[PDB]
Design a protein around this ligand. Structure first.
Ligand SMILES: [Mg+2]
Ligand SMILES: [Mg+2]
Ligand SMILES: [Zn+2]
Lengths: 258, 406, 90, 90
């Protein structure tokens, strides 16, 4: 057992150069250890500056990439999960990376740790909840999706009633409630947020898709992409949000009609 | 044979090994070696008339090829128009037009072919890329990686086209033995035959005029006897070959030729008029070095076979076999490859589809997007007449309204 | 010619334009080369679709071989060309 | 030179054993075998190191139960170097 430190470090870094999983684990371990050792070595302001620089570098990593290597993105997000100072990553970037690398669970963990730890610290919490709802929808967890939309996103009673009707597979009443909420003008308490209206639009699209109402579906998937009354279908290719929200339903409705 | 039209696709102003019909307008002539199938039109009256009316057209070839060509009296009119080029020496050739003062420079390099005295390759480098002409060459497997002039910094040069010799480009001639094995077999046979009595002679039925000098020289060096040939003045400037041949008929080993030598040998007589010395009859055996005969065997054969009581055949090929051709073409990896000659059995299409997987054609592409517009149905034939009861079913869903304008 | 997709068609067009090159010997040699090229191209063809395409191109009434020979019969400079045409037709 | 970050090696043990067993690349396989040998030595050293405090040595039973089969199957491997390295170890 009287081996030298080199006899353990050299084969470790040798394996790390040839296996991406071992490299991912070793880098995360070293990062966590170095960030833990600096607490007993530097002051509060220096640690804050270092963590801000780390956050900026991680945002630059998640924003400037085209291959979306699953080990790299998973390592970055798992490292951000372990430190409360790195939980402030851009939620949109994290969600896009997880949707492009098929790493939804690690992004869900990151967003949940950000919603838990940063709770005492559009609002950022609303954006994180929206991205978490999108990540949960991407894996087919619709019960947690409706729970999030009832507890955090939805604030009116019309939203609660529409989601309650949609839970019983009563998509007609749910679509009617969503249309009434989208066309309402006289809000006694206050105007609904933008996230709530986007959820209303997407849920109405889902209800029209379930009811096989292809004309209403193609109307609702293109009525909010342009200003002209006959919509320009090429406006879809402008926004990546459009390309992800309205493109599948529009294509499906057009193909069903054809 | 030579199915080459003596005209490269990249450089149509130069003709190689063919001067028959369209090569009378060429600006420079090249000659690989001194075989008759690569010399069509070289003695034509039209070419004779053109040579005496021009001053800038020349015939480039190996020095040994020049020596072998100027010896023949029928080709001595090329004496002032032949420019010999050393091998492995990149020289610049001027393709100047006769009529107009236009000019064009090209770099040619002569590479050894290992086929017959004076056989070389032609490596051209100009504006249209690098092309290679290996006219009737012979390379063993693993020798293409040893040519210095075909490598640029340890890697093969970018070759655009290769006009290679496809004489034995077919699965029948899979692996022809090296000429050293055939040489050793013939040497052993001739030794064991002529070592008995001074009256035992050995004939060598060599069909080609040049290409068997290796066998003659090595048999002479290993047996001390001098081979008999018809003419030897062609090797007057080649001491290493001239001192192995003799015109005297009083030698044991013979390699003389005659159109009716077969019947003469059947009558126990060499092609030369001598049939016996000192009135003592001669015991003759015939060894015919060839390759096409071995390519038709149906079972395991040997290098030296015995087809009669005084007849033998040897597998001596001055052409690269199918495996050697494949290895050479795969090591060069050129963009294109054109067969110079089509085998007797094989055809053009089979040789082409054999050579194509070896060429550097590793570039594929997805098919072009075929558009779909003006759908094949104009009117909605699937429209309903809309007659209902409206009471058995629930109320219809109202049309949604969206006023968001982003 | 730009019709390089089907080399037979561009070869026939160049052969037809050859007859207008002042009826010279160099034009005759170029025409003979084009004729041999198109012949060896049409011979190696095996697929029946491209085969029918080529047999319709070579026998067209505008740039075909028959109209080429009929208009080049008054020129002695194209003797080898007509001979090669007839051999390829056989 | 100025710090000692703590790294837990038991997070690499399953992947390292999987590599040492079924790595196609020869260099990757031999590197994983050397790393696994060093990690087994480290496990032995940690299990034998007695904490001078009130806490005892950490139980390596849950790690031994899944490490020993891998070592047994490596000590009888078809590879010469791996077998010669892991047979004396076993
Ligand atoms: Mg020849
Ligand atoms: Mg030859
Ligand atoms: Zn003789």
């Amino acid at each position: 057992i009287q081996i030298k430190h080199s006899s353990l470090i050299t084969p470790l870094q040798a394996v790390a150069q040839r296996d991406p999983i071992i490299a991912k684990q070793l880098f995360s371990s070293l990062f966590s250890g170095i960030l833990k050792e600096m607490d007993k070595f530097k002051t509060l302001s220096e640690k804050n500056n270092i963590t801000q620089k780390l956050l900026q570098d991680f945002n630059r990593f998640l924003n400037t990439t085209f291959s979306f290597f699953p080990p790299f993105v998973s390592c970055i997000q798992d490292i951000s999960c372990q430190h409360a100072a790195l939980l402030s990553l851009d939620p949109a970037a994290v969600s896009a990376g997880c949707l492009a690398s098929l790493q939804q669970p690690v992004g869900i963990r990151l967003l949940e740790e950000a919603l838990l730890r940063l709770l005492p610290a559009l609002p950022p919490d609303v954006l994180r909840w929206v991205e978490l709802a999108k990540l949960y929808r991407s894996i087919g967890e619709y019960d947690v999706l409706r729970g999030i939309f009832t507890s955090e996103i939805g604030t009116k009673q019309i939203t609660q009633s529409a989601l309650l009707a949609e839970a019983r597979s009563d998509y007609s009443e749910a679509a009617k409630q969503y249309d009434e909420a989208l066309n309402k003008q006289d809000w006694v308490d206050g105007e609904p947020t933008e996230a709530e209206k986007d959820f209303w639009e997407l849920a109405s699209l889902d209800c029209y898709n379930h009811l096989a109402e292809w004309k209403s579906l193609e109307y609702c998937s293109t009525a909010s992409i342009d200003s002209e009354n006959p919509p320009d279908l090429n406006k879809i290719w402008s926004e990546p949000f459009y390309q992800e929200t309205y493109l599948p339903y529009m294509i499906r409705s057009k193909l069903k009609l054809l | 044979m030579s199915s080459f039209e003596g005209q490269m696709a990249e450089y149509p102003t130069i003709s190689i090994d063919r001067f028959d019909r369209e090569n009378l307008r060429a600006r420079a002539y090249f000659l690989s070696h001194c075989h008759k199938d690569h010399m069509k039109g070289l003695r034509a009256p039209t070419l004779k008339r053109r040579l005496e009316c021009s001053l800038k057209v020349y015939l480039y070839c190996s020095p040994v090829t020049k020596e072998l060509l100027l010896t023949s009296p029928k080709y001595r009119f090329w004496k002032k128009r032949i420019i010999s080029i050393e091998i492995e020496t990149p020289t610049q050739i001027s393709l100047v037009d006769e009529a107009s003062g236009e000019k064009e420079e090209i770099v040619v390099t002569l590479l050894p072919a290992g086929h017959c005295p004076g056989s070389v390759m032609f490596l051209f480098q100009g504006n249209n890329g690098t092309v290679l002409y290996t006219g009737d060459f012979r390379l063993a497997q693993g020798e293409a990686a040893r040519m210095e002039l075909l490598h640029s910094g340890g890697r093969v040069k970018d070759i655009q086209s290769v006009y290679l010799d496809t004489t034995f480009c077919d699965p029948r001639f899979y692996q022809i033995p090296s000429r050293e094995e055939c040489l050793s077999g013939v040497l052993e046979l001739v030794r064991s035959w002529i070592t008995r009595s001074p009256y035992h002679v050995v004939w060598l039925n060599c069909k080609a005029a040049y290409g068997y000098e290796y066998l003659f020289t090595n048999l002479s060096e290993e047996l001390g006897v001098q081979v008999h040939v018809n003419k030897l003045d062609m090797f007057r400037n080649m001491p290493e070959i001239l001192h192995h041949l003799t015109t005297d008929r009083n030698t044991q080993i013979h390699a003389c030729r005659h159109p009716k030598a077969e019947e003469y040998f059947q009558w126990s007589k060499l092609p030369c008029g001598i049939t016996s010395r000192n009135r003592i009859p001669l015991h003759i055996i015939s060894i015919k070095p060839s390759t096409m005969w071995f390519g038709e065997r149906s079972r395991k054969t040997n290098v030296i076979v015995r087809t009669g009581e005084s007849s033998y055949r040897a597998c001596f090929s001055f052409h690269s076999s199918y495996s050697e051709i494949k290895d050479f073409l795969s090591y060069l990896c050129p963009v294109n490859a054109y067969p110079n000659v089509i085998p007797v059995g094989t055809t053009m299409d089979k040789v082409v589809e054999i050579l194509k997987p070896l060429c550097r054609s590793s570039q594929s592409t997805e098919p072009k997007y075929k558009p779909l517009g003006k759908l094949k149905r104009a009117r909605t034939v699937h429209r309903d007449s809309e007659e209902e009861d409206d009471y058995l079913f629930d109320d219809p869903l109202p049309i949604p309204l969206r006023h968001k304008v982003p | 010619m730009a019709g390089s997709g089907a080399g037979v068609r561009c070869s026939l067009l160049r052969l037809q334009e050859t007859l207008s090159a002042a009826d010279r010997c160099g034009a005759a040699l170029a025409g003979h080369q084009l004729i041999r090229g198109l012949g060896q191209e049409c011979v190696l063809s095996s697929s029946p679709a491209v085969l029918a395409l080529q047999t319709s191109l070579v026998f067209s009434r505008d740039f075909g071989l028959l109209v080429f020979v009929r208009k080049s019969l008054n020129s002695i400079e194209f003797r080898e060309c007509r001979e090669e045409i007839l051999k390829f037709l056989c | 030179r100025e710090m000692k970050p703590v790294i837990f090696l038991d997070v690499f043990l399953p992947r390292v054993t999987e590599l040492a067993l079924t790595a196609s690349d020869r260099q990757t396989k031999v590197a994983a075998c050397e790393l696994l040998h060093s990690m087994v030595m480290f496990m032995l050293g940690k299990a034998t190191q007695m904490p001078e405090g009130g806490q005892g040595a950490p139980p390596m039973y849950q790690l031994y139960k899944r490490t020993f089969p891998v070592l047994l199957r490596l000590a009888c491997d078809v590879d010469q170097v791996t077998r010669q390295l892991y047979e004396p170890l076993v």
